[PDB]
Symmetry: C3
Subunit: 113 residues, 3 copies
């Protein structure tokens, strides 16, 4: 059970923190959205929220990651929501399949329930 602080950036100017699946998973188009396990857990740094986005090299290989919002105070496991677009896609364990982007959480007076 690992916190977001254990994630790494590919390069200094990389916007995203790499996310890997902890399991070998095969996806087919007819399966629809699948939630892939990462072994990485919220919560996020104060005043930030997360966006899970695809890596372009993985998108172009036919695996769509659905953009996912990670709430600031989520303490569960970050999962990647993914779908094989046209073809059979195989994710090997430890392959980098998504990225976590951190963004400022703007305060508003919207009511909270």
């Amino acid at each position: 059970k690992q916190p977001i602080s254990k994630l790494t950036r590919a390069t200094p100017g990389s916007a995203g923190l790499d996310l890997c699946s902890t399991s070998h998973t095969v996806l087919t188009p007819e399966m629809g959205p699948q939630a892939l396990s990462t072994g990485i857990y919220g919560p996020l740094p104060p005043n930030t929220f997360g966006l899970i986005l695809g890596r372009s090299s993985i998108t172009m290989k036919g695996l769509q990651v659905y953009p996912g919002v990670i709430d600031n105070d989520y303490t569960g496991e970050i999962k990647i929501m993914a779908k094989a677009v046209n073809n059979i896609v195989t994710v090997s364990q430890g392959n980098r399949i998504a990225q976590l982007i951190l963004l400022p959480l703007i305060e508003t007076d919207n009511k909270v329930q």
Copy 2:
């Protein structure tokens, strides 16, 4: 006709403001992108823009929300662009199907036309 200020957050640390459809809508894969009415209108707080994203529980049920950019000064109705991925999806009136994220609008010197 309701402003974004009438939206609510599920919880204090929730990144997104919940968006519901004002209509019962059935979607099938062959229908392609459909714009669902929300009865909620721009514009956005100063120096912010909006991103419409899916709720993960709804994505995993086979309804894809296409990420949508809400411009700061848009004064029209915020619609959710949505597609049934694989199966027939039914949206009941008032079910929460998307979320609005507010983000800082960065100024640039890019020319404006």
Copy 3:
């Protein structure tokens, strides 16, 4: 070879900078994700990263742009990752098919490799 500074905003309050394809491209659903050339190159303003998102009018016409992360220091050509959802889509040269959003790049102590 044109920098992001040559991009234009539709309007002052437009969140996104317009991206056009430099080629006439026809897309069919069975083709899967295609990377469309823009002739526009990184890098991004300091402390920012980019998100490529669809234009709603183009999404509703059946062309899905996969959200793409542009790293701050990417110096290559910005490409639009796109897919025809259900039908045959034709992109004419110079038609605006996506938008670039600029966002703050938050610093973290995540290790960098």
